[PDB]
Amino acid sequence: QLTLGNSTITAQANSVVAYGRWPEYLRPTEPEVAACRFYTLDTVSWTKESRGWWWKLPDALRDMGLFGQNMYYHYLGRSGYTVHVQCNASKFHQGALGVFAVPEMCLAGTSYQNANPGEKGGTFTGFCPVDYLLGNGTLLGNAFVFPHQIINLRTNNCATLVLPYVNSLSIDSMVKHNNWGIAILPLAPLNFASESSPEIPITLTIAPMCCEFNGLRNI
Amino acid sequence: HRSRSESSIESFFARGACVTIMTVDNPASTTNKDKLFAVWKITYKDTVQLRRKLEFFTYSRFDMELTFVVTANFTETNNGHALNQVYQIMYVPPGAPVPEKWDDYTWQTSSNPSIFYTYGTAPARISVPYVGISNAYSHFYDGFSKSLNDFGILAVRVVNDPNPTKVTSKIRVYLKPKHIRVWCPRPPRAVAYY
Amino acid sequence: HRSRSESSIESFFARGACVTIMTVDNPASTTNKDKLFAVWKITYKDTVQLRRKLEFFTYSRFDMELTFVVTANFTETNNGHALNQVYQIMYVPPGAPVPEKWDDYTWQTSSNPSIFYTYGTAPARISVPYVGISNAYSHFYDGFSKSLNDFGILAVRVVNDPNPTKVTSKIRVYLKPKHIRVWCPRPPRAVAYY
Amino acid sequence: HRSRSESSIESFFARGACVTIMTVDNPASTTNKDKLFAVWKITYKDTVQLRRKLEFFTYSRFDMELTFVVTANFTETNNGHALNQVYQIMYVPPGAPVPEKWDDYTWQTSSNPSIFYTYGTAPARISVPYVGISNAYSHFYDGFSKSLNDFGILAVRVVNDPNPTKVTSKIRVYLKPKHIRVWCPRPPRAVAYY
Amino acid sequence: GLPVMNTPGSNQYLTADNFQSPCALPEFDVTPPIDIPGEVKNMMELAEIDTMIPFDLSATKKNTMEMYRVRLSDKPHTDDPILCLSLSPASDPRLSHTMLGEILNYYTHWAGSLKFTFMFCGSMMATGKLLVSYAPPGADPPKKRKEAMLGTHVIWDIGLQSSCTMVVPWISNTTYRLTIDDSFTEGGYISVFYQTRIVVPLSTPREMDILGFVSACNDFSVRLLRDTTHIE
Amino acid sequence: GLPVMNTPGSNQYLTADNFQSPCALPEFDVTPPIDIPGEVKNMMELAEIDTMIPFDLSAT
Amino acid sequence: GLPVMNTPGSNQYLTADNFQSPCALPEFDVTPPIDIPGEVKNMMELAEIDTMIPFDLSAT
C-alpha cells in the first residue's frame, strides 16, 4: 500500500530506474500532492491476438485533473514519472510482456491527433504502427536498448519504471512535447488452460515525480 | 592487454566524409548565364553513413570541422589561360539571410564569415562551433510546431570577373564532427531505410 | 549562465567588410591607354553597414586592419601568358601628396609605405594605427571651418611593364577596425538615410 | 674506434625504395575510357631488394612510412591547360572493401583514410602503423588453411572532372619500414630465386 | 629569421589529423550542456545491453515478431537440438542483428566473451529440464544429447528457474579475431537439448516459447573501424 | 632546420581571425586618448536606456 | 606573426630523413609484441655464426 495522497494502489520485478538516474528537482513550483497522485489509467485487455499498446507522456495525463489542469495552464513544465504496469493473471496463464520507455518515441507509422492519443493509448499492428519494427523502422530485438522491463507471467506480474526527465531543454512546455513513451509489446503471445479467462487485464499507474511548472495562464 | 579506446564516441564519429559537391562556374565573357553561386544548407541527412551513425542516439552535441577541396576544369579546347580562380566561401550562420544572387549584399555583409581561396593552395578549413538554441541537437523530436536543427548554410562563388573560358568547378565539402557527445541510445535503423 | 561578452564594442565592430573595389589594368603593348592606377581615399562613408554601426556614437578611436584580395582576368581570347602581375599597393598617409600619374614620384617616395604583391599568394595586409590629429575621431562636428577625418589614401598599380594582354584586375579592400573605443552614444539613423 | 651501429636492424632496413608505379589518367571529355583509378595491394613481394632483405628472418614487426611522388604528362600536342590535377590517395586498411569503380562509395566512406594532393606540392606522406592480427608478421608459414600478411591497399584517382587533355599520371610509391624488429634469422635466399 | 624547412607531406589533407582549425564564430557563447541523463562514452556500452536474437528467420515468420521466439512443442523430441547457434557474431545471419552485429558491422577485429541468456516464457506449472551445451571453437556442433552432455554443459531446470545464463569464454590464439572471415567457421556452438520432455498439468497448453538474448561481457572490445554502409 | 609542415587551411583569409598584422607606420606616436566622458563598453549599455514606444503608428 | 624564412632544400624528398609523418590510423590499438625468442639486433650477429665454406666449387 502506497502513501501518495488520496490514491493508494496495493503493490506487493523490482524497480528499474531508467538510465540509472532518479527524477530530481531542477536546480518554479512544488505541487507536492497536487499532482503527485497515482493516476491509474484505464486497463487494456491482453488477448491472444493483441499486438501492442503505446502511451505517451505527459500526453496520457492530459485529463487527469490537477496534473492535466496544471500542464495545460502553464508554459514550462518538467516532471519524471514512476510508470507501473500490472498484469493480473493466474497460474494457468503463460506469456511475456516487454515494457519499453522510449524517449522521443516517434511512431512515424503524422498529425498531432494521431501521435498524441492520450489516456486511450494506442495499438500497434502486424493509425497502425508496425509492431515488428516497434513503429520506429528498427527491428524489435534491438528495442531492449531503451530503458525497459520484462513481465513474464511465471516469475512476476508487475514492472516499475522510474523515468527521469530526459529532454534537450532543462524545462519544456508539457502540452507540445512528449518526453517519454511507454510501449507494451507481447514478446511471447498469451496462452492459457482451457476454459480459463481468455483476456487478462493490464493496468498502468503513472505517478509524476518531482514535477515543476513555471508560468501561468489565468483561469 | 586490450584498450577499448577505439569504440569511444569521438573515435567512432570523428571521421571526415564528403557531405556535398557544390558546383559553380566562372561565367563566360559572353554572359550566357550569370555566376552559378552554389548554396547548400548544412545538413547531415544526405549522407547515409553519418546519418546512420548519428541515429544510434537521440541527442547529440557535436562541433563541425568543415573542409573544402576545390577542383576545376576548362569546358573548351582553347585554354584561355584564366588566372587562378579566387573562390569566396561564406558560412551563413543559422537564421541569417540566404543569398539569392551572385551580387547580393549577403556576400559583403559583416556578420557572415568568409574564406577566400586561390585555386591551388592547401584546402580551406573552418570549425563551426556548437551553434544551436537548445542544449543539445535532437535527431528525433516527439513534439509539434505550435529535429531539423539549423547548422547554417555554405555559399560559394567565384570572385573573379567574367572570362571567356567557362571554368567549371566542384567544391567537395568534408565534415568531421569533433568534440562530440551523445545521449540516449536508440536501436539502429536498417541500411535500406537510410 | 550567459556571458554578455558579445555586445562589446570590439565584438560588435571588429568585423571585416569590403569597403571598395579598386579597378586597375595592365596596359597593352599598343599603349591604347596608360596604366589605370586606382586611387581611393580611405573613408567609411561608402559602406552602409559600417557607417550605420559607427553612427551610434559621436567619437571613436579605431585602428584599421586593411586587407587586399587581388583578382584579375584576360580581356581577350588569346592567352598571351602574362607572367604573374606584381601590384604595388601604396598607403599614402594623411596629408601626403596624392598620386596623379602611374609614374609619379609618390610611388618611389620614401615616406609612403608600400606592399608588393605577386598575384597568387596570400592576401596582402597592413594595419594603419590610430592616425589623427585630435584625440578621437568625430563622426558629427558641430563647428565650422574658420567630421571628414582623414585616414589616408590607397593607391594601387601594376609594376610590370606593358604586355599585349589587357589583364584587368579588381582589388577588393576589407577593413576591420580593431582596438576600437567609442564614446557618447547617439540615436541610430534609419536604414533609408544610409 | 669503430661503432658497429650501422648493421643494426633499423639501419639495414630503414631505407626507402620504390615499391610500385601506379598509372592513372584524367579521362578526356570525349569519355573514350572512364577514370583509370589505380589500386595496388600493399605487398613487399614485388621488390627484390626489400623482399630479400626481409627473408633473412622469419618474423618481423615493421611500421610502414609510405610516400608518393606524383608526375603527369599531356598525351597530345595541344596543351589544353588542364588546371593542376587533384589526386585522392586512399589507404584501404586490411579487410575493408576494395574499390571497383572510380565512383564507388569506398572513396567517400568514412573509415578509409585519404590524402588530397595538388600536383606540384611536396610529396604526400602517411605512416601505416603495425597493422596485423598476429603479434608479428610472418614471411614463412609452416601451417595450412583450415604468410601473405595483409597490409592494406592503396587506391589513387583524379578528383578533377573530365577535361579534353588525357593527362596521364604515374604515382611512384616509396616504402620505408621504420621501428622494425626481426626474429629468428634464416639463410639468405639466392639472388636468382628473388 | 628562424628559417623553417617544409617537409614531405605538406599542403595535403590527410583525413585523420587533428591540426587546429580557425573558429568561424570566435565571439559566440555556445549554449552550455545541461547534463541530460543517459550519456554513452563507448559504443561497447551499447553492445553490453542484452538484445534479442531472431532464432527463426523462416520466410513466413521473418519480418514479424514470430522470429524471436522458439516453440518447445511436446511431440517428436527426436534427440536433436532445439536450437544450435554459432558463436561467431557479425557473421551468423541469426546473430548479426542483435546490436552486436550492428556494432561489429562497423569494425574489423573483435575480442571478448559473449553472454547468452535463455528465458522460458511458459506457465509456472510447466516442469522439465533442458540442456545448454557449449562446443568450444574447433569442435563440431553436437548432434545428440549424450555428446552434448559429455562436453561443457549446464542443466537448466525450467521448473524452478526461468532464465539460464551462459558466458562463452574468450579463447583464441590471437589477441583479436577477425570479425567477418569466411575461412574460420569453427568459432564454437551453443545448443539447447531436451533433457526431459515437458510435463504440464491439466489442460495447460503444450506449446511454449523460449527467448534468447545475446550481450557482450565486461571485457569485450573491437578495433579497426570499417563502415561499409553504402546505399547504391 | 626545424622543419615545419603546413596544414589544411593555409594561405587563406578567414574574416574572423586575429593573426598579427604588420604596422604600416611603425614609427608613429599616436595621439593619446584624453578620457572623454561617456564611454560605452557593451552595446547592451545602450539597450538599458529607457527609450520611447511609438504606440500609435496610424497612417496620419 | 613569428615570421619564418624557408631555406634551400625545402619542398624536397630526401630519402634519408626522419621528419615525423602523420599516422594514417591514429585510433588503432596495435597488437603488442609477445617477446618471441631469437631476436637479432645487429646484422653482425648473423656474421658471427660459424657457417660452412664451399671448398670445392668444381663443375660436378
**Concatenated DSSP letters for D13-67?**
H---EEEEEEEEEPPPTT-SS----EEEE--STT-HHHHHHHTTEEEEEEE---E
Computed from CA positions of residues D114, B116, F11, B131, in that sequence, does the dihedral angle turn out positive or negative? negative
In this complex, how many residue pairs, one in chain D and one in chain E, have their CB atoms less than 8 Å apart? 74
Task: Return the residue matching grid coordinates 593573426.
Answer: F19
**Contact call for residues B81 and C74 (beta carbons, < 8 A):** yes
Q: Where are the alpha helices (DSSP H) in chain A?
A: 66-71, 112-115
**How far from D20 is each of C190, D66, D124, CA to CA, in Å?**
69, 11, 15
Residue C52's CB is within 10 A of a number of other CB atoms, namely 15
**How far from G39 is each of C56, D49, G33, CA to CA, in Å?**
78, 22, 12
Q: Give Cα D1 to chain centroid, integer Å.
A: 40
**Contact call for residues D154 and D19 (beta carbons, < 8 A):** no
Alpha-carbon span A190 to A88, nearest angstrom: 13
Provide the grid cell at A118: 492520450
Query: What are the chain D neighbours of G24 within 8 Å (beta carbons)?
Result: 91, 113, 126-129
Alpha-carbon span C52 to C63, nearest angstrom: 18
Which residues in C46-92 belong to E strands, given as ranges?
57-63, 67-73, 86-92
Query: What are the chain C neighbours of B163 within 8 Å (beta carbons)?
Result: 73-74
Q: Please answer yes or no on whether E174 and G2 come within 8 Å at the CB atom.
A: no
Alpha-carbon span E107 to F39, nearest angstrom: 60
User: Nearest-CA neighbor of B176 among B86, B70, B53, B83?
Assistant: B53
Provide the grid cell at C26: 595592365
**E15 Cβ under 8 Å from any chain F Cβ:** no
Provide the grid cell at A33: 500532492
**Nearest residue, CB atoms, C184 vs list F38, F41, F49:** F38
Q: Please answer yes or no on whether F46 and C59 come within 8 Å at the CB atom.
A: no
Buried-exposed string G35-51: b where 16+ CB fall within 10 A, e elsewhere: eeeebbebbeebeeeee
Spatial strand order of the sheet with C178-185 comes to: C137-138, C57-63, C178-185
Q: Which residues of G touch B (CB under 8 A)?
A: 27-29, 32
**How far from B8 is each of C5, E24, E41, E42, CA to CA, in Å?**
34, 27, 6, 4
Before A58, cis peptide (omega within 30)?
A: yes
Alpha-carbon span B131 to B190, nearest angstrom: 29
Which residues in chain B belong to E strands, given as ranges?
17-25, 38-41, 57-63, 67-73, 86-92, 114-118, 124-125, 137-138, 153-158, 168-175, 178-185
Q: Where are the alpha helices (DSSP H) in chain D?
A: 9-13, 48-54, 105-108
Provide the grid cell at C104: 609619379
For residue A78, list its beta bridge partners: A212
Provide the grid cell at G25: 590510423
Q: Which amino acid is at D102?
A: W
**Contact call for residues D166 and G19 (beta carbons, < 8 A):** no
**Contact call for residues E16 and G25 (beta carbons, < 8 A):** yes
Alpha-carbon span D67 to D175, nearest angstrom: 7
Q: Give Cα E85 to chain centroid, integer Å.
A: 11
Q: Please answer yes or no on whether A191 and E207 come within 8 Å at the CB atom.
A: yes
Spatial strand order of the sheet with D114-118 comes to: D38-41, D153-158, D86-92, D114-118
Query: What are the chain A neighbours of E102 within 8 Å (beta carbons)?
Result: 142
Provide the grid cell at D122: 611536396
Q: Please answer yes or no on whether G37 and D183 come within 8 Å at the CB atom.
A: yes
Q: Where are the alpha helices (DSSP H) in chain C?
A: 9-13, 48-54, 105-108
Residue D6: CA count within 13 A, CB half-sphere: 2
Radius of gyration of chain E (CA): 24
For residue E70, list its beta bridge partners: E210
**How far from G18 is each of B112, D174, E88, F7, G22, CA to CA, in Å?**
43, 14, 43, 19, 12
Backbone angles phi, psi at A141, to 5 degrees: -60, -45
Helix (H, G, I), strand (E, B) or coil at C10: helix
Spatial strand order of the sheet with D137-138 comes to: D137-138, D57-63, D178-185
Q: Please answer yes or no on whether C3 and E29 come within 8 Å at the CB atom.
A: yes
Q: Please answer yes or no on whether B121 and F10 come within 8 Å at the CB atom.
A: yes
Helix (H, G, I), strand (E, B) or coil at C140: coil
**Contact call for residues A36 and A209 (beta carbons, < 8 A):** yes
Q: Is residue B21 packed enough to be buried (19+ CB in 10 Å), middle (13-18) or exposed (0-12)?
A: middle
Alpha-carbon span A158 to A155, nearest angstrom: 10
Alpha-carbon span D55 to D16, nearest angstrom: 17
Helix (H, G, I), strand (E, B) or coil at F50: coil
Helix and strand element counts for chain C (H, E): 3, 11
Helix (H, G, I), strand (E, B) or coil at C79: coil
User: Nearest-CA neighbor of D138 among D68, D77, D61, D78?
Assistant: D61
Q: Please answer yes or no on whether F8 and E5 come within 8 Å at the CB atom.
A: no
Final resolution, Å? 3.3
Computed from CA positions of residues B128, B134, B138, B140, in that sequence, does the dihedral angle turn out positive or negative? negative
Residue C184's CB is within 10 A of a number of other CB atoms, namely 18
**Contact call for residues F57 and C26 (beta carbons, < 8 A):** no
Report the phi/psi class of residue E38: left, alpha or beta, with left for phi > 0 and alpha for psi in -120 to 50. Answer: left
Alpha-carbon span D39 to G22, nearest angstrom: 22
Q: What string of H, E and C letters represents the secondary structure of chain E?
A: CCCECECCCCCCCCCCCCCCCCECCCCCCCCCCCCCCCECCECHHHHCCCEECCCCCCCCCCCCCCCCEEECCCCCCCCCCCEEEECCCCCCCCCCCCCCCCCCCCCCEECCCEEEEEEEECCCCCEEEEEEEEECCCCCCCCCHHHHHHCEEEEECCCCCCEEEECCCCCCCCCCEECCCCCCCCCCEEEEEEEEEEECCCCCCCCCEEEEEEEECCCCCEECCCCCCCCC
User: Nearest-CA neighbor of G14 among D15, C63, E70?
Assistant: D15
Query: What are the chain C neighbours of B110 within 8 Å (beta carbons)?
Result: 15-17, 49-50, 53
Provide the grid cell at E17: 589529423
Alpha-carbon span C84 to C90, nearest angstrom: 19
Provide the grid cell at A168: 534537450
**How far from E197 is each of A152, D8, E126, CA to CA, in Å?**
22, 70, 11
Provide the grid cell at F8: 589544411
H or E segment and range at residue D184: strand D178-185
Provide the grid cell at E181: 572471415
**Nearest residue, CB atoms, F40 vs list C9, C67, C69:** C9
Provide the grid cell at E230: 553504402
Q: Which residues of D touch E (CB under 8 A)?
A: 67, 93-97, 105, 109-111, 113-118, 121-126, 131, 133-135, 145-146
Helix (H, G, I), strand (E, B) or coil at B106: helix
Alpha-carbon span E31 to E172, nearest angstrom: 48
**Nearest residue, CB atoms, B110 vs list C17, C75, C77:** C17
Shortest Cα distance, chain F CAs vs residue E32, angstroms = 22
User: Nearest-CA neighbor of B83 among C166, C40, A79, D134?
Assistant: C166
Question: Which is it for strands A16-17 and A158-162: parallel, antiparallel or unpaired?
Answer: parallel
List CB contacts of F34: < 8 A, sequence separation 6 or more: C135, C136
**Contact call for residues C80 and D81 (beta carbons, < 8 A):** no
**B168 Cβ under 8 Å from any chain C Cβ:** no
Chains A and C touch (3+ CB pairs under 8 A): no
Q: Which residues of E touch C (CB under 8 A)?
A: 27-29, 32
Query: What are the chain D neighbours of E226 within 8 Å (beta carbons)?
Result: 93, 95-96, 111
For residue B190, list its beta bridge partners: none
Alpha-carbon span D176 to D49, nearest angstrom: 12
Buried-exposed string B70-86: b where 16+ CB fall within 10 A, e elsewhere: bbbbbeeeebbbbbbbb
Alpha-carbon span D115 to E15, nearest angstrom: 7
Q: Which amino acid is at C150?
A: D
User: Nearest-CA neighbor of D65 among E161, G20, C3?
Assistant: G20
Q: Which amino acid is at F23?
A: C
Task: Return the residue matching grid coordinates 498531432.
Answer: A112
Alpha-carbon span B153 to B133, nearest angstrom: 16
Alpha-carbon span E97 to E86, nearest angstrom: 14
Computed from CA positions of residues D91, D92, D93, D94, in that sequence, does the dihedral angle turn out positive or negative? negative
Alpha-carbon span A173 to A57, nearest angstrom: 12
User: Nearest-CA neighbor of B173 among F8, A125, E149?
Assistant: F8
Give CA torsion, residues E42, E43, E46, E52, to 10 deg. -160
Helix and strand element counts for chain F (H, E): 1, 0
Alpha-carbon span E214 to E113, nearest angstrom: 11
**Contact call for residues F5 and E7 (beta carbons, < 8 A):** yes
Alpha-carbon span C136 to A58, nearest angstrom: 61
Q: Which residues of D, range 15-54, sit inside 8 Å of B by Cβ?
A: 29
Q: Which residues of E, range 22-41, sit inside 8 Å of F by Cβ?
A: 22-26
Helix (H, G, I), strand (E, B) or coil at C30: coil
Residue D51's CB is within 10 A of a number of other CB atoms, namely 16
User: Nearest-CA neighbor of C175 among C20, C51, C66, C50?
Assistant: C66
Alpha-carbon span A92 to A126, nearest angstrom: 27
Alpha-carbon span C72 to C22, nearest angstrom: 12
Q: Is residue F2 packed enough to be buried (19+ CB in 10 Å), middle (13-18) or exposed (0-12)?
A: exposed
Residue D149: CA count within 13 A, CB half-sphere: 20
- Identify the closest residue of chain B to D81 by CA–CA distance: B79
User: Nearest-CA neighbor of D57 among D193, D187, D194?
Assistant: D187
List CB contacts of C190: < 8 A, sequence separation 6 or more: none
Residue D49: CA count within 13 A, CB half-sphere: 12
Report the phi/psi class of residue E95: left, alpha or beta, with left for phi > 0 and alpha for psi in -120 to 50. Answer: alpha
Provide the grid cell at A175: 502540452
Residue C93's CB is within 10 A of a number of other CB atoms, namely 17
In this structure, chain G runs to a length of 60
Residue E183's CB is within 10 A of a number of other CB atoms, namely 8
- Mutation target for F interface from B91, B111, B116: give the one with most F CBs within 10 A: B116
Query: What are the chain B neighbours of D80 within 8 Å (beta carbons)?
Result: 74, 77, 79
Query: Which residues in chain G precede a discontinuity of more than 2.5 Å between C and N?
Result: none
Q: Which long-range contacts (CB under 8 A, 24 or more apart) does D99-107 make?
A: D99/D37, D99/D39, D99/D155, D101/D37, D102/D34, D102/D35, D102/D36, D102/D37, D102/D157, D105/E230, D105/E231, D105/E232, D106/D155, D107/D155, D107/D157
Backbone angles phi, psi at D48, to 5 degrees: -65, -45
Alpha-carbon span C137 to C132, nearest angstrom: 7
Computed from CA positions of residues C108, C110, C115, C116, in that sequence, does the dihedral angle turn out positive or negative? positive
**How far from C189 is each of C52, C55, F54, CA to CA, in Å?**
7, 7, 16
- Identify the closest residue of chain B to C19 by CA–CA distance: B108
- Identify the closest residue of chain E to G33 by CA–CA distance: E175
Q: Which amino acid is at E190?
A: I
Alpha-carbon span B129 to B125, nearest angstrom: 13
**Contact call for residues A102 and A147 (beta carbons, < 8 A):** no
Angle among Cα C13, C19, C21 to the nearest 5 degrees reads 160
